[PDB]
Every structure is written in C-alpha cells, then in structure tokens.
Design an enzyme around this catalytic site. Structure first.
Site, PDB file in Angstrom:
ATOM      1  N   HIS A 135      28.111  49.543  40.344  1.00  0.00           N
ATOM      2  CA  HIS A 135      29.167  49.099  39.533  1.00  0.00           C
ATOM      3  C   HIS A 135      29.355  48.032  38.595  1.00  0.00           C
ATOM      4  CE1 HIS A 135      29.985  47.141  43.342  1.00  0.00           C
ATOM      5  NE2 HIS A 135      30.248  46.179  43.296  1.00  0.00           N
TER       6      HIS A 135
ATOM      7  N   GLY B 162      31.025  38.800  45.786  1.00  0.00           N
ATOM      8  CA  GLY B 162      29.967  38.464  44.916  1.00  0.00           C
ATOM      9  C   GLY B 162      29.172  38.784  46.038  1.00  0.00           C
TER      10      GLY B 162
ATOM     11  N   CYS C 297      27.591  41.808  46.552  1.00  0.00           N
ATOM     12  CA  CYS C 297      26.707  43.328  46.113  1.00  0.00           C
ATOM     13  C   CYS C 297      25.922  42.618  45.355  1.00  0.00           C
ATOM     14  CB  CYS C 297      28.179  44.240  45.334  1.00  0.00           C
ATOM     15  SG  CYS C 297      29.412  44.036  46.007  1.00  0.00           S
TER      16      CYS C 297
HETATM   17  C1  LIG Z   1      30.876  43.421  45.582  1.00  0.00           C
HETATM   18  O1  LIG Z   1      30.617  42.222  45.700  1.00  0.00           O
HETATM   19  C2  LIG Z   1      32.166  43.713  46.549  1.00  0.00           C
HETATM   20  C3  LIG Z   1      31.692  42.871  47.740  1.00  0.00           C
HETATM   21  C4  LIG Z   1      33.176  43.415  48.856  1.00  0.00           C
HETATM   22  C5  LIG Z   1      34.604  42.662  48.409  1.00  0.00           C
HETATM   23  C6  LIG Z   1      34.752  41.767  49.147  1.00  0.00           C
HETATM   24  N1  LIG Z   1      33.800  42.944  50.923  1.00  0.00           N
HETATM   25  C7  LIG Z   1      33.002  43.187  50.394  1.00  0.00           C
HETATM   26  O2  LIG Z   1      32.051  43.526  50.583  1.00  0.00           O
HETATM   27  N2  LIG Z   1      32.444  44.921  46.704  1.00  0.00           N
HETATM   28  C8  LIG Z   1      33.423  45.631  45.949  1.00  0.00           C
HETATM   29  O3  LIG Z   1      34.581  45.212  45.980  1.00  0.00           O
HETATM   30  C9  LIG Z   1      33.697  46.891  45.751  1.00  0.00           C
HETATM   31  C10 LIG Z   1      33.612  48.013  44.592  1.00  0.00           C
HETATM   32  C11 LIG Z   1      33.460  48.975  44.695  1.00  0.00           C
HETATM   33  C12 LIG Z   1      33.724  49.986  42.921  1.00  0.00           C
HETATM   34  C13 LIG Z   1      32.677  49.645  45.341  1.00  0.00           C
HETATM   35  N3  LIG Z   1      35.234  47.867  46.326  1.00  0.00           N
HETATM   36  C14 LIG Z   1      35.229  47.106  47.424  1.00  0.00           C
HETATM   37  O4  LIG Z   1      34.809  46.519  48.636  1.00  0.00           O
HETATM   38  O5  LIG Z   1      36.725  46.961  47.618  1.00  0.00           O
HETATM   39  C15 LIG Z   1      37.645  46.942  49.020  1.00  0.00           C
HETATM   40  C16 LIG Z   1      37.874  44.788  48.838  1.00  0.00           C
HETATM   41  C17 LIG Z   1      37.648  44.879  47.915  1.00  0.00           C
HETATM   42  C18 LIG Z   1      38.382  43.187  48.129  1.00  0.00           C
HETATM   43  C19 LIG Z   1      38.369  42.485  49.193  1.00  0.00           C
HETATM   44  C20 LIG Z   1      38.577  43.558  50.211  1.00  0.00           C
HETATM   45  C21 LIG Z   1      38.167  44.947  50.504  1.00  0.00           C
END
Ligand SMILES: *[C@H](O)[C@H](C[C@@H]1CCNC1=O)NC(=O)[C@H](CC(C)C)NC(=O)OCc1ccccc1
Ligand SMILES: *[C@H](O)[C@H](C[C@@H]1CCNC1=O)NC(=O)[C@H](CC(C)C)NC(=O)OCc1ccccc1
Lengths: 300, 300
Positions: B41, B143, B145
C-alpha cells in the site's frame, strides 16, 4: 493506537556485552572503550560470600585470573581496579561497537529497559521501574549478574543499572554504573530484605491518561477534587503523595485529552474506593504504576 | 526468579530496517540481502486506498519512484515486483548486516517480538501473541507499517509478521513475509472488523505453571478433573478446548512442579468459576494467555 510495555531497541547494548569468568564464577560484563565493568562479587568463592573483605580478595588476584570473552574472541586483561561494588577490567582492545553513552543514576519511579544476559549472550529485553523501595521486579536467574539497565535518547545510551542480586521476596537489587547500590543493600550474605513499597501515583495518573487516549473512558466523571483531599486518599491506600510538580508534569497529557489533572485524580479516588467492578483499563484489572508520563507521551 | 513479558534482543533486526517513500507515503522496509520488503500500500494515494487495483497502480510506477534510505545512505532501487500484499524492491547493495533468517508463518496462540519502527528508525520492542482471530494487540501509530515481528532461535531470525493496518477496535492486522494476510483482512478500505476472539487455554495453563515456579501457590488444590469435564467449563467461559497434544506439551512443566496437568485444569476451573477474590497471580488480577509453554520454559 494501542499501549504496550515497550523496551528500547537493544542493539547498541548487545554489542557491549561480554562474559567474565573468575575461578568458577561466570557472569556478564559491559565493554565500553577499553574497560569491562562487572559486579565485584565475581572474585568471591562460596565461603567468601558470607562476609567478604573485597579489598583483601582483590589484592590476591592478578590480571590473568580474569577471563573475558567477547563472543568468540578472548580479551586480554591488562589492569584491574575496584570502584565501589563494580570491578573495572582494563583490556587491550577498545570495543569498536562502543555507542555514545552516559552513566546516570535514576530516581524511584523512573523506568528503564533491562537486557537480560547469560554467559555474555543477550537473552531478552523488558521494561522495569525503580520501585520507591529501590528494588526492581525483574526476571533474573543464576548467571544474570552484570546485565544492565538503560534508556536511549537520540543515539546516546544512558546506563543506569547493573544487576547484582535477588532478595528473599523475589525482587532484584543492583547498582548504578559507578558501583553504588540502589537502596540499603550490600553485596554479601545477610538477612537483608526489601523495605515497604508504595504505589507511584504520578505514573498511575499517566497510565489513566494513556487509557483515555486509547478509548477507555468508563472511569471518567464530572466531579473534581482538591490536591489535599486527594492526598488524604492516597495516604490511606499506600500511594505516594502527589506534588504540584507532578501536576505540572502531567500538563501535556491533560491538555491533549482535555481532562484536568485534578479531575483525573477524582477518577483515581473513585477507583481506589470502589475498585473496577469487573471492568478493565488497557487490558489490566489493576492500576498500573510502571509507566512514566514520558513513557506515555513517547508511545501515544 | 521473576516472570516478565520479555522480547528477543532486537539488534539483528534493527540492522535490517530501512525507510521506504513513494509519493507522500512513508513507511518501513526490511532489507535482507539485495531486496527490501514492504507493504504494497506504499504505492497508494488517498483516493486509491478505497478500492485499489494494485496491479494497475504498480505498472504505472518506476524504480525511481521508490526512495529507500538505510540510515543516512540512499539505496538505489533497480527492480520492483509484487508478491501478494508485499512489494519486493531489488536494490544495488546487499545488506552487510543480513542475519541468518527464515520466513515462517505462525499459528494463533504463538508469540513473537515486534520491533516498532518509524521513518526506518527502530522505536521500541515488545512481545505479541497471534490471537485466535488472527489479530494482534500491538502498539502502532501512523508510519509504523512495515515494522516486523520475529522470533530468534540460536543465531537465526524467523520473521513471521509485517504490519499493515489497524482495525476499528484498536487491534492490528498484517501479513507473513510472503505477503499473505493473517486472517480475513485486506489492504483496502472496507468495514472489516475483527471476528470474535477466545482465550488461549494452553497458554493460561503455562502461565499458572510459571506462577507456581515463582512461588504463587494459593490457587492450587488437591482436586482433579477429567479433560472432558474441563472442556465443558472452557466452552462456557469462551476458552479454547484443551487437546491431548496440549497436555503433552505441558508435560515438562508438570514434571518440574509435580502438579499434573489435569490438577492444574481443576485449579483453572475454580478460577474461572470463582474469580481471584482480590488476589493476584504474577502481578495480574486477570488470567494471562500470551505466554506459550516455550516462553515459560525459556524464562523459568
Ligand atoms: C501504516 O503505517 C498504517 C498503520 C496504522 C495507522 C494507525 N495504526 C496503524 O496500525 N496503516 C494504515 O494506515 C492502513 C492502510 C490501508 C491501505 C491498509 N489503514 C488503516 O490502518 O486504517 C485504519 C486507521 C488508520 C489511521 C488511524 C486509525 C485507524
Ligand atoms: C548473579 O548472577 C546472581 C543473580 C541472582 C541469582 C538468582 N537471581 C538473581 O538475581 N547474584 C547472586 O547470586 C548474589 C551474589 C551475592 C554475593 C550478592 N546473591 C543472591 O542473589 O543471593 C540470593 C539468591 C541466590 C540464588 C537464588 C535465589 C536467591
């Protein structure tokens, strides 16, 4: 989100751990520049460790009585000296992996990471707090002496703890890296025991703020309290008194959540007086006191 | 003695972490030999991340769209490909710090250490268990991921987890290092949610044995139970059924303590039916299920 007991990455410290053998005693040392630091009781025998005179024991030793192994490389000891309860073994090679470091002494209520080691080989990493009674609740077996505790800020390792012993209640005692014990403990055999402990109130408050940041809100209320009235409750439940400096330190967490410090104190008063009624906070059914306000800000 | 949630020393993994930027998205990658692995992603934009076609998105990219930083050194990307939900970025330099490693997929109930990382820089290390519902209860912010989970046996790092997302309940989801998700989760925006979870019974039993080894005995009794009768209680309390293989795996801990597995099951039945009555086990007022029998033997 989420909130876990999290240690600092240990790589910088792993590169400093060595094995020190004297006689039949094996433990760990910390190799920084051309010195290896280790607990002085490495020079004792079973008989000595009752009431040893370390100055006498050390004058009877020579450099060649200390065998130092850095992985699979023998380090040649070229000098030895005692500093309080640690030995300083001068070796002929400076550790090329020496990080930027400091020797700091911590206060009760502060946290650090422990790199548990055996035979000079790191085994695991975990977070500890220095208790009000100057013990730590660690996980240490025979052979673990000389394992160190540390914090990392930017690229600099601040070493704060070296492990020496286990007390009868199963808690642990040791020194700063200048070899001065934390607490009223000695590296010899007595009936010494941990004194009475108390709960670190400012840390419980920080952890309640971490809980709110992470979506646990059930313990919140509209009521407030005075600092004096809260400290009356703290005394009754064997919690340390809360100072205005603690209130100031919690300011940033209070601002982030919009919950005034004294409002959170009212929540804590209710938790102390009524318990949790089968509920949990951040996966615990007890009030957790081993996260500092900094630990909470760092993670949340 | 003592018993702590203990992670593996992280040094071997710290030396593999890099930063990967594509467009305005920054996350972490794992640099092993001349390949950097990272969540696919990284190539998405805000608009794409609703229902992205990754094959289309990737054909529109070139090597020069991927910026890889190993500390303060830029790595030149010379090839790119997609494997399931991970990207493989071929770089012109093999990582000289590559440890012996394996890519393993773990089972629910197994534990591993997580090296949380931001901007390619390790931030902290902690232990996680893979839940029965294929989530983990971690601590991850924007950040994070591309952070990885791993176990270490002898000198070999077995990578088992790469972080991709947070679910609405605050728990975390990700893939093995071949890019296959744990659980029924996808790297796109849906209303996806963790399914119902259960407690890992064999691990609770292991932790009760750890408690006995460490001097907590109050929950012991002379009574015993049958496996069938215990599993009737487990079902009622949303615990996983106990198999004869679990009993066999607990054999060594049963031998060390002299408490038969089915006797410990009778203790657990009583704890489930009556609670703890204000007492604690290994510093917890809840039954802990994130220590495997191996974790207990390793530490105790
Ligand atoms: C990658 O760094 C990130 C890690 C997340 C951000 C908040 N806590 C984590 O573990 N992944 C994403 O943002 C992910 C991307 C998709 C295309 C798979 N989406 C996600 O986790 O959405 C839910 C979310 C985002 C931000 C804050 C709380 C939940
Ligand atoms: C150094 O490796 C060792 C660490 C102990 C051993 C058990 N748990 C630990 O933390 N230190 C000692 O054995 C120490 C030596 C004195 C001269 C200071 N004495 C000690 O801890 O005695 C108490 C004890 C020993 C063995 C098992 C349980 C308690």
């Amino acid at each position: 989100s989420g909130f876990r007991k999290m240690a600092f990455p240990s790589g910088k410290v792993e590169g400093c751990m060595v094995q020190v053998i004297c006689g039949t005693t094996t433990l760990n040392g910390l190799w920084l520049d051309d010195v290896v630091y280790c607990p002085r009781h490495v020079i004792c025998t079973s008989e000595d460790m009752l009431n040893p005179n370390y100055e006498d024991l050390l004058i009877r030793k020579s450099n060649h009585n200390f065998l130092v192994q850095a992985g699979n490389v023998q380090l040649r000891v070229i000098g030895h000296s005692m500093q309080n309860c640690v030995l300083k073994l001068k070796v002929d090679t400076a550790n090329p992996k020496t990080p930027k470091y400091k020797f700091v002494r911590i206060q009760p209520g502060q946290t650090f990471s422990v790199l548990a080691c055996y035979n000079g080989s790191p085994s695991g990493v975990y977070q500890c707090a220095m208790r009000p009674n100057f013990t730590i609740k660690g996980s240490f077996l025979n052979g673990s002496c000389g394992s160190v505790g540390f914090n990392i800020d930017y690229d600099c390792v601040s070493f704060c703890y070296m492990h020496h012993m286990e007390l009868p209640t199963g808690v642990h005692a040791g020194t700063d890296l200048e070899g001065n014990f934390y607490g009223p403990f000695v590296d010899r055999q007595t009936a010494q025991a941990a004194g009475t402990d108390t709960t670190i109130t400012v840390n419980v408050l920080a952890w309640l703020y971490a809980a709110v940041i992470n979506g646990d809100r059930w313990f919140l209320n509209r009521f407030t309290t005075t600092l004096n009235d809260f400290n009356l409750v703290a005394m009754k439940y064997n919690y340390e008194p809360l100072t205005q400096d603690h209130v100031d330190i919690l300011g940033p967490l209070s601002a982030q959540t919009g919950i005034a410090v004294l409002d959170m104190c009212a929540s804590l008063k209710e938790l102390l007086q009524n318990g949790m009624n089968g509920r949990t906070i951040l996966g615990s059914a007890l009030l957790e006191d081993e996260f500092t306000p900094f630990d909470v800000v760092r993670q949340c």
